[PDB]
Nucleic acid binder design. Structure first.
Lengths: 72, 83, 360, 231, 33, 38
RNA sequence: CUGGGGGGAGUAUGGUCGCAAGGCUGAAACUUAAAGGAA
């Protein structure tokens, strides 16, 4: 759904996000500081994010090739 | 006649928590009691040039010209500002 | 002949991807319906920086200034200096050089001269601690942003020595099918031309917000004394969260201005960082552009990187549309096979990129 | 006009007027110890009293009587207060060699200006509320920029002690009278000394500038009060 | 009916005493007889 | 082309200023390389 | 209470890892007090 929305290129990007639910500015969009203060007064939301040579090269490239197939 | 040192001590007693008066007085006595950076001719009937200042502008001019040519030397592009 | 874009959005990314791909572009209608229409001075000086970095690229600005023609050339690098204007800091010009940086004849040794920081741009600590590690594990190994002196706005007067000296062939294919465990959380609180107590006030505010998570918080402190302080008073704070087993990092920064409480700014940057951790998965919302750019100019293989639901936005998909508009490649968002969260894994098959400027 | 607030050496404050007799009211136990400096707000309805009992207090005018409502206790003997001329900042000079700038609307602790190296007398805030002065017994006045709390000059005047320092109404020029029988006229742009006025004989305890126009009176230890106008 | 607030204003001369002197200066660039 | 020796230096105001403040540093620290009477 | 590199006396070092200089202190965002040092 989302890939077809992204590459369907006759609709605006905010319309893609709207029917799914600008880079000179480097730092991304954040909320107001007051909304973020009441949102992150709690902390428990993200506590689980917190806490021979020749055959070796051939094994790395065959690992990449099987990744290629199983993702194709 | 009298010494440049005697005239310099007299000029300091003349000029004497303000700052800009001292900046002005120091710059005045420096460019007055420095006679080897002007050039004086003799009037046959007199400051006629400023050698060090003319030299430094003539060599800074060709210094920026030389750096500009060294910047140009192996370029091939250029923006074309038609504005 | 020319791939045509409209509007003055994503301007640096368009010129950067045109330099990478070697495709002549036109950007039309640079703010044409405006009172002072056309290109602005900071993006004109960015064009001058592109002419400094490359060689044989012809840029052709129009009469009205509202359309530009970029016919790219070979990235050659060399040593340079860039006196960027007061409208944008040095981060606005060193951010798009990190894409072109490892793909040149001679290594990048540039020093930018101007304002160091801005509210809406990248800082020295942002560029260094956030954007250098993603290049450091995408394949480069010797890259360094040095501060020789830094200048807070409005007068600035700070110089920044960007030196990259690993000229790789192409970036490696990324494989991040995990969410990296955050091992530590560090940072840097800087202040120039003000009292040294503001830094400790910023650090204490950030760490009193951070104190309830059971990790380890460490914020380093630098006041800048002397000629290294620049021409204006300023202070700011940049936190990173550090996954040490792989090297990943998630950053957030800001700067204070005339009338700003340092404990307020410290707790604001702390909460903004925790929200970046929330809305992040293996990248940041601002480290994501050059991450997927290096994935798309990697080898001719599949490289896959995990992202979450909230990192998709109009900026991210206008990036993807510009990527496909220039060199005709798509991303494939496959979802993960476990359902306590909404994370895609973006697989990009990279184009067959090599750097052909480095002499053999 | 026609109404005077005053604080005394002991814990007492007092109010008088011009038409009627002395005492509107006194407030016994206005403070626990010696009061040191008070300041009205620019509308006058709310005044600030800082005293040597390590406290400042705020008072309102209820109808013509004084209403104590809030009190900020510090760690150290506050000995000068001032507000900005546009109700914006509250700068208070402590005995601990520093001043603190607060926001009146929050008691926010905006700034701490530090580095004077003796206990610090009179403050003044400029008309644009951008530039403060800071006098002390270190024989020098410091100019501070209030936006970031950054110092500008540290000019050494007055070889005994600067008792008071006051701006002009509309300009960044200011006056400072000191404990060595001299008042001094400065500018806040070149930081020169405009004038060195030499009429007193002993310790000049206070000076006050006109609200508009700018003629300044100075009053001293030799029981003298003298006016200073323009040429 | 008094509203008694407190204050604390610790000074940070040690933050300049622990500036880039040695460690941060080096790190902020990356028998008998 | 390559050239044999460096030319004689032109004496401008910058080099006289640098030389004079060198002299001023020496003359206010009394760093004088005089002969000392035996 | 079993485990071992390779002679003695030196010398050099554009390699790697360290430790180390400046320069009156106070004193910097402030050309700023007292006091001390030096001569």
């Amino acid at each position: 759904n989302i890939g077809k929305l992204i590459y369907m290129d006759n609709i605006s990007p905010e319309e893609c996000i709207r029917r799914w639910r600008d880079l000179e500015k480097f730092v991304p969009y954040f909320d107001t500081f007051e909304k973020l203060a009441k949102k992150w007064k709690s902390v428990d939301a993200i506590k689980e994010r917190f806490l021979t040579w020749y055959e070796l090269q051939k094994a790395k490239i065959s690992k990449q090739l099987e990744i290629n197939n199983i993702e194709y | 006649a009298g010494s440049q040192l005697k005239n310099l001590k007299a000029a300091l007693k003349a000029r004497g928590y303000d700052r800009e008066e001292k900046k002005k007085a120091i710059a005045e006595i420096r460019e007055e009691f420095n006679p080897f950076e002007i050039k004086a001719a003799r009037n046959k009937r007199i400051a006629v040039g400023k050698p060090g200042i003319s030299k430094q502008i003539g060599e800074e001019q060709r210094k920026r010209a030389f750096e500009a040519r060294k910047m140009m030397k192996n370029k091939r592009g250029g923006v074309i500002d038609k504005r | 002949k020319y791939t045509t874009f409209q509007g003055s959005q994503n301007f640096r990314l368009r010129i950067v991807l045109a330099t990478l791909s070697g495709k002549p572009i036109k950007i039309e209608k640079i703010r044409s319906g405006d009172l002072n229409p056309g290109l602005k001075d900071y993006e004109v000086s960015f064009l001058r920086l592109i002419e400094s970095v490359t060689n044989g690229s012809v840029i052709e600005i129009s009469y009205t200034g509202t359309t530009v023609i970029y016919r790219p050339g070979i990235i050659v690098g060399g040593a340079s200096t860039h006196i960027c204007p007061s409208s944008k800091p040095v981060g606005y010009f060193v951010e798009p050089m990190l894409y072109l940086a490892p793909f040149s004849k001679k290594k990048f040794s540039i020093l930018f001269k101007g304002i160091t920081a801005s509210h809406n741009d990248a800082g020295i600590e942002a560029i260094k601690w956030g954007l250098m590690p993603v290049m450091e594990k995408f394949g480069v190994r010797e890259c360094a942003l040095h501060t020789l002196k830094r200048g807070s706005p409005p007068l600035g007067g700070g110089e920044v020595h960007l030196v990259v000296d690993s000229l790789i062939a192409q970036p490696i294919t990324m494989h991040e099918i995990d969410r990296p465990i955050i091992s530590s959380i560090t940072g840097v609180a800087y202040s120039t031309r003000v009292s040294p107590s503001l830094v400790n006030r910023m650090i204490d505010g950030a760490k009193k917000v951070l104190k309830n998570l059971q990790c380890e918080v460490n914020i380093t402190a630098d006041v800048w004394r002397g000629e290294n302080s620049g021409k204006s008073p300023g202070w700011g704070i940049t936190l990173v969260a550090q996954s040490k087993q792989k090297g990943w990092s998630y950053f957030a920064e800001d700067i204070g201005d005339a009338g700003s409480i340092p404990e307020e700014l410290g707790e604001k940057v702390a909460c903004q960082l925790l929200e970046e951790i929330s809305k992040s998965a293996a990248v940041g919302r601002n480290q994501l552009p050059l991450a997927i750019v290096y994935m798309v100019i990697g080898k001719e293989d599949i490289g896959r990187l995990r992202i979450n639901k909230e990192q998709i936005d109009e900026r991210f998909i206008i990036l993807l549309r510009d990527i496909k508009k220039i060199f005709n490649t798509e991303v494939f968002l496959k979802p993960v096979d476990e359902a306590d969260n909404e994370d895609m894994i973006a697989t990009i098959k990279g184009i067959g990129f090599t750097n052909t400027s480095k002499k053999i | 006009g026609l109404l005077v607030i005053l604080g005394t050496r002991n814990g007492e404050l007092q109010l008088f007027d011009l038409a009627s007799s002395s005492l509107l009211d006194t407030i016994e136990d206005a403070h626990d110890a010696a009061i040191w400096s008070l300041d009205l707000t620019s509308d006058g309805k709310r005044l600030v009293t800082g005293s040597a009992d390590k406290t400042v207090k705020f008072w309102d005018f209820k109808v013509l009587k004084l209403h104590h409502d809030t009190t900020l206790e510090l760690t150290d003997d506050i000995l000068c207060v001032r507000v900005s001329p546009d109700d914006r900042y509250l700068a208070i000079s402590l005995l601990d060699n520093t001043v603190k700038v607060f926001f009146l609307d929050s008691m926010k602790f905006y700034l701490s200006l530090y580095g004077h190296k003796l206990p610090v007398l009179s403050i003044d805030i400029s008309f644009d509320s951008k530039m403060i002065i800071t006098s002390s017994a270190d024989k020098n006045i410091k100019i501070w920029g209030l936006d970031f709390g950054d110092c500008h000059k540290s000019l050494f005047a007055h070889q005994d002690s600067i008792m008071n320092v006051k701006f002009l109404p509309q300009s960044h020029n200011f006056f400072s009278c000191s404990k060595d029988a001299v008042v001094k006229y400065w500018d806040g742009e070149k930081f020169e000394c405009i004038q060195k006025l030499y009429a007193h004989q002993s310790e000049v305890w206070a000076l006050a500038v006109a609200t508009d126009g700018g003629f300044v009176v100075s009053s001293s230890h030799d029981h003298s009060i003298r006016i200073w106008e323009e040429t | 009916p008094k509203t008694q607030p407190k204050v604390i204003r610790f000074n940070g001369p040690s933050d300049v005493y622990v500036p880039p002197s040695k460690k941060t200066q080096k790190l902020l660039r990356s028998e008998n007889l | 082309f390559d050239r044999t020796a460096k030319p004689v230096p032109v004496i401008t105001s910058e080099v006289t200023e640098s030389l004079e403040d060198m002299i001023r540093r020496r003359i206010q620290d009394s760093n004088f390389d005089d002969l000392q009477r035996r």
